Amino acid sequence: SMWTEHKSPDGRTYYYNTETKQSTWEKP
């Protein structure tokens, strides 16, 4: 909901928290 994930290095998708501004690979 608050996170937006898209492909990235290593060939995986990271979740970018729009509000918080947290871009990483983890359980959002």
UniProtKB/Swiss-Prot annotation:
<protein>
    <recommendedName>
        <fullName>Pre-mRNA-processing factor 40 homolog A</fullName>
    </recommendedName>
</protein>
<comment type="function">
    <text>Binds to WASL/N-WASP and suppresses its translocation from the nucleus to the cytoplasm, thereby inhibiting its cytoplasmic function. Plays a role in the regulation of cell morphology and cytoskeletal organization. Required in the control of cell shape and migration. May play a role in cytokinesis. May be involved in pre-mRNA splicing.</text>
</comment>
<comment type="subunit">
    <text>Interacts with the N-terminus of HTT. Interacts with the phosphorylated C-terminal domain of POLR2A. Interacts with AKAP8L, SF1, SRPK1, ENAH, ATBF1 and MECP2. Interacts through the WW domains with formin proline-rich regions and with WASL/N-WASP.</text>
</comment>
<feature type="modified residue" description="Phosphoserine">
    <location>
        <position position="8"/>
    </location>
</feature>
<comment type="similarity">
    <text>Belongs to the PRPF40 family.</text>
</comment>
<feature type="domain" description="WW 1">
    <location>
        <begin position="1"/>
        <end position="28"/>
    </location>
</feature>
